Each structure stands twice: as C-alpha cells, then as structure tokens.
Structure 1
C-alpha cells in the first residue's frame, strides 16, 4: 500500500520467504501481507508498536474475498524500533510458520488453501532491504 509489492512469487509449500528490513526509530506499525492478491491474504502479519490502541503486539489475520477473518495475537514481540529485523515464512496445507528474531516461531492457520503464495505487499514503518526465496 506504501511499501514494496511483489507478484508472481509462486512460493510453493515448504519453500522459504525471507524478508529483512529496517524498523523505523519511531515505528508505530508495519504490515507484511501474503497471499494471492490484495483481497485474498493467507497471512496479514501486523506488528503493532503503537497503533489501534495496541502496544508491542503482533496481530495476525487472513482475508478471504475481501473479508477479514478472525484475528489472532501473539504474546511475544521480538521487534525493536530502530533496528533491523528478519522474518522468515513458510507454509503447508495446515499452517503458515513464521520465524522471527530472537528464535521466536509461531504458526497461523492456513485458512485459504492456496496452491502457492503469489503476492506479497509491505506497508508501514519497515523499510525492506532484502527479499529471498528457496
């Protein structure tokens, strides 16, 4: 929406998407959206430093045909304003697996059953420096 948008990713099950960026010193929130297109997201990954009444909370959701799913939140927040952070994402039929800094890993249910992740879009206070596949 403001940041990098990539399409035709063809990321297949078990393949790793690695994204490294700079978290702004006064960051309020950033977003990585993954799926088919802007209306169909198997993962909306939204670390909220200070946004929507939330503080240092990772908010996740899906979007299916334009409709937001049921939000999920993690207890941990291994992001620091003003530092570099790497996020590594893979999926299978059941879950997306998101690996974060400081060894933290979590799963978010795969609610869309897409054949591949073809679309990624970044937004907010996170300046993408490197994106890789494998």
Structure 2
C-alpha cells in the first residue's frame, strides 16, 4: 500500500529521516505524520503538477471526521522527478521542524500540541528507500 512506519512512537525530541525516489511523471506525493490516514498532524505535499499548483510544497493537518484545515505553502522545491530526496523532521509541542535535501528548512505549527505520533507514511507518486527514527 503506502510505505508506513506504524506504532513505533515518534516522540518529542526524536528525529525522523526518510529517503526515497520521486517517480518519473509524478503528479504529487506526501509525507504524513499522525495517528491514522484520516488523522494527520503534519501533511507535507510535494506538488509537481496538481491543479494550478506546479513545483510547490503545501503543508496542512487533517482532522478526523472533520477535514483539512488552513494550508500553508512554500516555494522551496529542490525536488526532481526521477531523483532521490532526503527529509528530516523533528518537533516540539509548538512547531514541526522540517529540513529538505539541500539544507533549506520549513517550519509548520504543531496545531494540536501533540507530543507523540504513531503513524508515519508516504503516499502518492514516490517510494521510500530508507528510514531512521531514533
């Protein structure tokens, strides 16, 4: 299905590094940190071509039985279809700190003030090749 790491708690102070490859002809893919596929505290979507969006990062949270919240966008997009990427995420109770392949960073509020997450998954047009959660 999607690539996932489930029930190995990602807690305050730990770091998550995932690596993978973007598909040729990818439309978009995302990395998701939350509780379930319908309860996502940090959704980071990588849009190569999606609607009017081309080469933009879109960040949001998804609340169970409620839906997507306010989107934040970033123009930082060091991603190429067919190539590798590496992303590192840490968080405290206020902020998710994300670091991209080229060293650039994006920050996104921890809207629920959560301290641990039991599901990490990738969905869409990419695949993961390694993971470190420690």
- TM-score norm. by structure 1 comes to 0.93
| Contact persistence 1:34–1:42 (CA under 8 A) | yes
Q: Equivalent residue of 2:13, what SS?
A: coil
- Deviation of residue 40 (structure 1)? 1.7
- Deviation of residue 129 (structure 1)? 0.4
Residue 64 (str. 1) matches residue 51 (str. 2): no
Residue 117 (str. 1) matches residue 117 (str. 2): yes
- Deviation of residue 11 (structure 1)? 1.0
| Contact persistence 2:2–2:123 (CA under 8 A) | yes
| Contact persistence 2:20–2:84 (CA under 8 A) | yes
Please tell me the root mean square deviation across aligned C-alpha atoms, in Å. 1.2
Cα separation, 2, equivalents of 1:109 and 1:128: 25
Please name the residue that 1:102 is paired with. Answer: 102
- TM-score norm. by structure 2 comes to 0.93
| Contact persistence 2:39–2:62 (CA under 8 A) | yes
- Deviation of residue 133 (structure 1)? 1.1
Cα separation, 1, equivalents of 2:62 and 2:113: 12
1:3-18 correspondence to structure 2 within 5 Å:
3-18=2-17
| Contact persistence 1:20–1:87 (CA under 8 A) | yes
| Contact persistence 2:34–2:120 (CA under 8 A) | yes
Give the aligned length: 133
In structure 1, list runs of 5 or more residues that go unmatched.
Answer: none
| Contact persistence 2:92–2:115 (CA under 8 A) | no
- Deviation of residue 117 (structure 1)? 1.5
